[PDB]
Amino acid sequence: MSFNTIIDWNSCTAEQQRQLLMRPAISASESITRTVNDILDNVKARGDEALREYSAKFDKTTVTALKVSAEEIAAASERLSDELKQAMAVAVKNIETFHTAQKLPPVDVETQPGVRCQQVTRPVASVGLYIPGGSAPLFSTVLMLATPASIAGCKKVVLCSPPPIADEILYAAQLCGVQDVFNVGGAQAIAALAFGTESVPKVDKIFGPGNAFVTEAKRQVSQRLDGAAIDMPAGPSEVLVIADSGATPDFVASDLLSQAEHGPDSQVILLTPAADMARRVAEAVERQLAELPRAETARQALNASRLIVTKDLAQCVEISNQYGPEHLIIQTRNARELVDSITSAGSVFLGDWSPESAGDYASGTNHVLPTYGYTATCSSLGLADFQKRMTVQELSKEGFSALASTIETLAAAERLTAHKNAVTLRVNALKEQA
Amino acid sequence: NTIIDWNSCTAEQQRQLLMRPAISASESITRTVNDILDNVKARGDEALREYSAKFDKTTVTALKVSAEEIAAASERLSDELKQAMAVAVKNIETFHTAQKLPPVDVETQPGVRCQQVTRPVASVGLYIPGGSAPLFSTVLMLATPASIAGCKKVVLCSPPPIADEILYAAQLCGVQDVFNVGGAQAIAALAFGTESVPKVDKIFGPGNAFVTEAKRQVSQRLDGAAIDMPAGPSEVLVIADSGATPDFVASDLLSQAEHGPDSQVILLTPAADMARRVAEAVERQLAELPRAETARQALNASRLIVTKDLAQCVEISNQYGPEHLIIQTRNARELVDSITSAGSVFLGDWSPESAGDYASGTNHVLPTYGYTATCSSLGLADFQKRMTVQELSKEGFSALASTIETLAAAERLTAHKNAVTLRVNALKEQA
Ligand SMILES: N[C@@H](Cc1c[nH]c[nH+]1)C(=O)O
Numbered sequence: 001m002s003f004n005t006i007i008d009w010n011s012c013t014a015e016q017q018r019q020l021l022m023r024p025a026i027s028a029s030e031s032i033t034r035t036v037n038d039i040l041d042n043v044k045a046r047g048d049e050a051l052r053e054y055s056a057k058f059d060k061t062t063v064t065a066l067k068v069s070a071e072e073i074a075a076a077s078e079r080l081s082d083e084l085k086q087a088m089a090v091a092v093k094n095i096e097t098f099h100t101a102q103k104l105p106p107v108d109v110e111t112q113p114g115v116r117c118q119q120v121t122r123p124v125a126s127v128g129l130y131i132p133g134g135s136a137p138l139f140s141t142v143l144m145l146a147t148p149a150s151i152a153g154c155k156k157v158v159l160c161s162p163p164p165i166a167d168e169i170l171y172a173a174q175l176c177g178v179q180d181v182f183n184v185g186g187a188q189a190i191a192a193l194a195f196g197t198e199s200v201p202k203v204d205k206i207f208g209p210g211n212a213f214v215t216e217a218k219r220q221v222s223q224r225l226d227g228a229a230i231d232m233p234a235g236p237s238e239v240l241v242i243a244d245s246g247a248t249p250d251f252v253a254s255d256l257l258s259q260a261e262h263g264p265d266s267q268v269i270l271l272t273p274a275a276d277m278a279r280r281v282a283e284a285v286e287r288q289l290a291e292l293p294r295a296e297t298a299r300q301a302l303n304a305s306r307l308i309v310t311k312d313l314a315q316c317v318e319i320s321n322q323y324g325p326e327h328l329i330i331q332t333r334n335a336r337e338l339v340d341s342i343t344s345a346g347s348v349f350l351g352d353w354s355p356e357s358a359g360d361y362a363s364g365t366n367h368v369l370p371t372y373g374y375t376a377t378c379s380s381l382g383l384a385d386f387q388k389r390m391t392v393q394e395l396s397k398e399g400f401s402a403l404a405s406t407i408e409t410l411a412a413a414e415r416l417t418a419h420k421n422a423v424t425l426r427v428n429a430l431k432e433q434a
Numbered sequence: 435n436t437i438i439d440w441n442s443c444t445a446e447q448q449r450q451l452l453m454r455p456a457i458s459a460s461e462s463i464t465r466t467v468n469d470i471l472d473n474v475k476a477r478g479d480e481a482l483r484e485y486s487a488k489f490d491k492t493t494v495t496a497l498k499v500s501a502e503e504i505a506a507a508s509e510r511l512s513d514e515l516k517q518a519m520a521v522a523v524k525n526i527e528t529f530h531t532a533q534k535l536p537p538v539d540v541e542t543q544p545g546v547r548c549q550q551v552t553r554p555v556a557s558v559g560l561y562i563p564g565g566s567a568p569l570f571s572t573v574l575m576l577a578t579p580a581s582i583a584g585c586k587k588v589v590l591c592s593p594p595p596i597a598d599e600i601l602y603a604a605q606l607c608g609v610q611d612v613f614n615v616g617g618a619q620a621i622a623a624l625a626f627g628t629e630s631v632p633k634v635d636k637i638f639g640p641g642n643a644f645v646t647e648a649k650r651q652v653s654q655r656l657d658g659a660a661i662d663m664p665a666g667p668s669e670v671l672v673i674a675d676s677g678a679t680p681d682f683v684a685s686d687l688l689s690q691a692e693h694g695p696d697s698q699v700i701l702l703t704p705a706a707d708m709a710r711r712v713a714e715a716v717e718r719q720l721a722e723l724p725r726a727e728t729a730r731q732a733l734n735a736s737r738l739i740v741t742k743d744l745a746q747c748v749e750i751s752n753q754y755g756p757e758h759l760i761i762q763t764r765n766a767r768e769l770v771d772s773i774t775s776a777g778s779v780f781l782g783d784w785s786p787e788s789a790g791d792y793a794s795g796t797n798h799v800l801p802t803y804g805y806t807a808t809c810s811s812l813g814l815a816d817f818q819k820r821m822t823v824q825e826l827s828k829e830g831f832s833a834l835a836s837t838i839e840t841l842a843a844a845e846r847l848t849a850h851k852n853a854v855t856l857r858v859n860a861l862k863e864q865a
């Protein structure tokens with residue numbers, strides 16, 4: 001249906017092989033940047049009045065109260081089925097158990113007698129969460145963001161989403177303890193969280209992906225001093241599946257399609273030692289695609305897919321590590337054995353019964369992951385992103401005295417007399433006193 | 435001098451007192467650093483050698499410092515220094531090794547195994563400013579964590595000629611390659627790589643305005659590389675009570691001030707008497723510092739503030755979020771819990787900033803300019819990444835299947851839902 005079939009890796013030239021491992025390039029659109037720039041400055045200078053002006057020309061019912069009332073929340077709540085509410089409770093319980101398990105053990109050591117050094121954590125005081133709106137509300141992200149923030153001890157957690165806000169998002173927010181929910185979206189919401197308005201509190205860090213304007217807004221506020229920090233840069237979503245001859249074509253295909261339906265820009269890749277497996281997966285994908293209700297998105301994403309036949313699993317791992325996929329699914333006989341050799345990936349799924357779908361919703365891991373190659377240096381969203389590491393040290397007189405000569409020597413070597421003098425004064429004071 | 439009586443200040447005058455300087459970032463340098471990167475990415479080494487002629491008399495030939503050139507430098511250093519550095523490295527190594535994250539491995543539900551593991555950042559490049567007196571201590575601070583993290587490639591760039599202290603330092607911490615390159619071009623070389631300098635995944639280390647600007651740029655490019663953290667002027671804030679020693683407080687403010695003319699120096703104390711004595715001690719000590727023009731210049735921005743009580747010192751400190759916080763009070767340790775924002779904290783009268791900058795073992799590469807609000811001190815974590823792993827058994831998956839379908843269904847993600855149904859049906863037929 002307008003596309004490729006399979007690629008024999010070793011049949012490609014060294015150059016072509018390097019072109020596949022590369023991801024598409026993004027523009028900059030001098031226009032969107034300028035548009036977003038004016039949006040941010042406007043929101044900072046004219047607050048809620050400015051937000052209502054945008055709400056006006058962007059809606060048939062200009063928003064009045066920015067903060068969703070507690071009454072509107074309880075109403076949305078009752079309208080959801082018990083089935084769905086219970087499903088969310090299961091997801092939150094497992095997400096909570098996994099992230100709670102990431103709490104850093106205390107770091108407290110005496111590098112040498114009398115020289116006590118510690119590392120303690122402090123939560124980011126206030127965080128803002130953004131959730132896109134629309135037809136199909138991806139309320140699960142609310143669970144992924146608010147849960148870790150709650151566990152970290154963040155003092156303030158607020159959320160913005162394009163009005164009207166779905167009952168699922170509102171319920172997901174209440175369930176995770178989100179304190180305030182605001183009727184704002186796009187680059188304006190990011191600006192509202194980053195700068196603050198009469199209604200929206202200024203937060204220290206903003207979490208949550210969005211469209212091109214949300215992404216640009218997050219980039220801009222992270223680069224401004226009067227702005228705020230952000231969770232991570234965005235990029236197209238990806239999935240790489242490593243499958244041997246023992247995998248089930250339909251399982252492989254269902255995972256490639258799950259990722260593909262996340263957007264026309266999703267990158268889906270299959271690495272398999274078996275040409276036969278590749279062919280079967282390609283056909284399963286075609287057959288399953290034909291049953292997908294609204295598969296135009298999935299269809300377009302598949303045009304950039306790559307079903308690669310390799311020499312063996314070792315070459316599969318070599319290729320995967322060079323790529324560093326956001327999601328890595330290992331459907332091979334010795335799945336867990338390979339993990340150790342996996343040097344780069346956002347989140348790994350092992351075996352036939354670990355669908356990407358299980359991780360997006362209820363296994364407990366976070367589905368907010370690095371993509372577009374950022375897997376090379378950034379990590380999966382976790383507890384650490386809602387905290388800060390602070391260092392503390394205390395030297396006793398004895399500890400200080402034994403380290404003094406070393407400090408003076410080094411300070412003197414760097415020609416920083418005042419640093420050296422700070423030690424000398426203390427040393428003489430100690431001789432004196434006793 | 436000039437003592438500030440905090441509470442006699444208008445609420446506005448107050449925040450204006452602690453406010454940090456503004457930003458220049460003059461387009462002049464934004465462009466200069468830009469065309470510099472492009473050139474390096476297109477014409478690699480040929481570009482680098484063209485930039486050596488310009489800045490500094492080196493006309494660099496071989497970019498990589500030879501092993502023989504390093505051994506010679508090592509021999510020219512005194513035993514006293516070499517031994518000083520071993521103490522530093524040993525302590526730094528001990529503190530960062532202690533930061534290792536114990537592995538996370540749990541079953542959120544029976545048969546649903548979730549783990550968090552760590553992987554090192556593949557390759558990292560370290561930048562060290564040159565000059566007559568180089569702060570070679572930064573080498574120990576960056577290269578030691580990189581060694582502990584298990585980074586496969588660790589390289590360092592520094593303006594030629596590179597002092598012996600830097601070469602020895604690099605070698606002691608196991609840096610693999612040292613390159614005769616600096617400024618905005620050294621950063622571009624690490625981000626894009628050249629025929630001699632390898633492309634790295636993350637770049638660490640502070641430097642002048644051009645280095646700072648190049649890091650920002652390469653961190654904002656798909657073709658570039660990630661960086662450790664944004665830059666800013668260094669800061670020191672001392673909280674001292676009636677029991678503190680004027681000369682000790684002054685020596686810490688001056689330690690920070692002697693770094694650069696933009697250093698922020700701040701004293702908070704509930705005793706006017708103490709503030710006045712500290713100002714006098716600063717005056718006396720200043721007159722004896724050789725390279726003290728900049729220290730005096732930094733002090734033009736200093737603040738000697740008198741608060742009403744100790745609690746108010748903690749309040750102001752938390753609002754500011756200083757890079758270095760020194761607590762010279764009689765119960766320093768107990769105050770720590772109430773400190774919500776600071777880069778590195780020093781407790782008591784025997785914990786001078788100098789100790790932390792050199793051998794206590796903590797890292798002196800800290801977040802500043804208010805970034806302590808969300809950013810952290812450099813540590814092991816900045817040289818690695820967390821990767822999650824999950825494996826659901828047949829039982830675990832079956833116990834979660836319904837939940838996943840219900841959720842996927844609500845988000846209208848059909849393929850996500852069908853991935854579960856396919857598996858549930860397969861299990862039913864094998865049951
Ligand atoms: N795949 C989405 C997460 C998700 C939500 N629902 C299903 N999946 C992401 O990239 O964040």
Ligand SMILES: N[C@@H](Cc1c[nH]c[nH+]1)C(=O)O
Binds near residue numbers: 569571791799
């Ligand atoms: N005080 C410096 C580090 C330093 C290097 N040498 C002496 N001190 C800082 O943390 O910015």
Ligand SMILES: [Zn+2]
Binds near residue numbers: 258262356357
């Ligand atoms: Zn998904």
Ligand SMILES: [Zn+2]
Binds near residue numbers: 689788
């Ligand atoms: Zn210092």
